[PDB]
Predict the 3D structure of the following.
Amino acid sequence: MPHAFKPGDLVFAKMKGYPHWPARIDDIKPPPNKYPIFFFGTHETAFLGPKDLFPYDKCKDKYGKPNKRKGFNEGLWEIQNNPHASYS
């Protein structure tokens, strides 16, 4: 019986030109039905809507796999080993 997305939720996040990326919902004026997403590895943030947001536990078997992009494998590390830490 899923809830809505909340700060601390772990996801993969899909933006264009990039693979599904280990990320978390950050704390926050937020654009309508968009969330502040923190991308592990890159330590960039962006506002994304639920359609681009894939829960970590359900989807990790598919998306949670190494990739050559800059930051990605580090981000895999962060999301599995210390997902709630400070990355700034």
